[PDB]
């Protein structure tokens, strides 16, 4: 059966900067099943308010998704996106660069 | 410009543990109006718009009687297609359906569609003309022929060039504030030391809409797609999108580098410079 | 808005 490995980006809606609220993103695409855990990690910690996009598909038939919470960039904060699938032999960490 | 009404629907079965999970998104373009989720506790479709979240109660309750039926469907589906792969009753497996039309600038009818896929390939498609099926394997013959008999692609057709596009002008016109603006993409370029003789250069297009948009970096003018790290569009959430284009550079020759952005709300394409 | 019909594989 068909399996496709879900892309993954981590990232801010709005330009970071430290002590302004925003909004943390975790954006996963191409992914077949749709079955997929997605956390996001405040320094290694998974985050209790989460929410995600409804459940979507391209063109290619595969899955995306947007996980998302609202939180306020500090210089000393890490933040990361682990996620797990059937085509991942292991979950996967993708840590927020907030420069780029 | 066209417009675009879609609608996504996924079932996913759960063997063993109660019936399939069922979800269902509406989109107006690269905008999200409606959703339904079996697994939530509303058991109705609902809003995901501001500007169609007062349709009204009528308007509500069809869309949940009918959501609700298309639900049903599905579940019938994966029990059908499980018996014409003669597939195990554990495995857990996953239904894909996708329709909606497209109404030309002057908002009149341009083309419907109408796709079903079966763990994630396709397996029956309405043909452009609306009259006839494309069938990807030896199951979906059977499904071919019994929707040829039953007349299914002329009710389709009916909803297509009616019921469909009808509607979509209306939420052009309710949502006409979000729907019918186009947001300019906001770019900007930085620069990071890679090492002592490299240097990556990003290209950013921040807060546009629609999705729709090219960037491209070129050196001296010749096309550096082989080389340039090109990110998927990505959604913002707040219902604006993102992309972002890199090359490595030798530290030096920034000044050789340009990136040129192509997007439905700016007057002119873009060309950025490092300088 | 959804089609009323209920066309099955």
Same mark, same amino acid.
């Given at each position: 059966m068909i399996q496709r490995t879900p892309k993954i980006q981590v990232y801010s809606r709005h330009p970071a900067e430290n002590g302004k609220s925003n909004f943390l993103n975790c954006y996963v695409s191409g992914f077949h099943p749709s079955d997929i855990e997605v *956390? &996001? &990690?405040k320094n290694g910690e998974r985050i209790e308010k989460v929410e995600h996009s409804d459940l !979507?598909? !391209?063109? *290619?038939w595969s899955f995306y998704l947007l996980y998302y919470t609202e939180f306020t960039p500090t210089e000393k904060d890490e933040y990361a996106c682990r996620?797990?699938?059937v085509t991942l032999s292991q979950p996967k960490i993708v840590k927020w660069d907030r420069d780029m | 410009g066209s417009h675009s009404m879609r609608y996504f629907f996924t079932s996913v079965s759960r063997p063993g543990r109660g019936e399939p999970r069922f979800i269902a998104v509406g989109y107006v373009d690269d905008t999200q109006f409606v959703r339904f989720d079996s697994d939530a506790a509303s058991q109705r479709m609902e809003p995901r718009a501001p500007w169609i979240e007062q349709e009204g109660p009528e308007y509500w309750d069809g869309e949940t009687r009918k959501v609700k039926a298309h639900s049903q469907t599905h579940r019938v589906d994966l029990g059908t297609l499980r018996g014409y792969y003669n597939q195990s009753e554990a495995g857990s497996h996953t239904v894909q359906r996708?329709?909606?039309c497209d109404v030309g600038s002057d908002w009149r009818f341009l083309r419907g569609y109408h796709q079903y896929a079966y763990d994630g390939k396709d397996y029956i498609?309405?043909?452009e003309d609306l009259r006839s099926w494309t069938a990807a394997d030896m199951a979906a013959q059977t499904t071919k022929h019994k929707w040829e008999a039953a007349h299914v692609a002329e009710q389709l057709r009916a909803y297509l060039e009616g019921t469909c596009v009808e509607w979509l002008r209306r939420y052009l016109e309710n949502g006409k504030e979000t729907l019918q603006?186009?947001?300019?993409?906001?770019?900007?370029m930085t620069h990071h030391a890679v090492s002592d003789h490299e240097a990556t250069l990003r290209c950013w297009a921040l807060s546009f809409y629609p999705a729709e948009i090219t960037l491209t970096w070129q050196r001296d003018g010749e096309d550096q797609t082989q080389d340039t790290e090109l990110?998927?569009?990505r959604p913002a959430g707040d219902g604006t999108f993102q992309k972002w284009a890199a090359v490595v550079v030798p530290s030096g020759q920034e000044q050789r580098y340009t990136c040129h952005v192509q997007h439905e709300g700016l007057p002119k394409p873009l060309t950025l410079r490092w300088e | 808005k959804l089609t009323p019909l209920?066309?099955?594989l």
């Open positions: *956390d &996001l &990690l !979507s598909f !391209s063109k *290619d996620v797990n699938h | 996708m329709y909606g498609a309405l043909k603006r186009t947001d300019a993409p906001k770019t900007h990110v998927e569009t | 209920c066309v099955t």
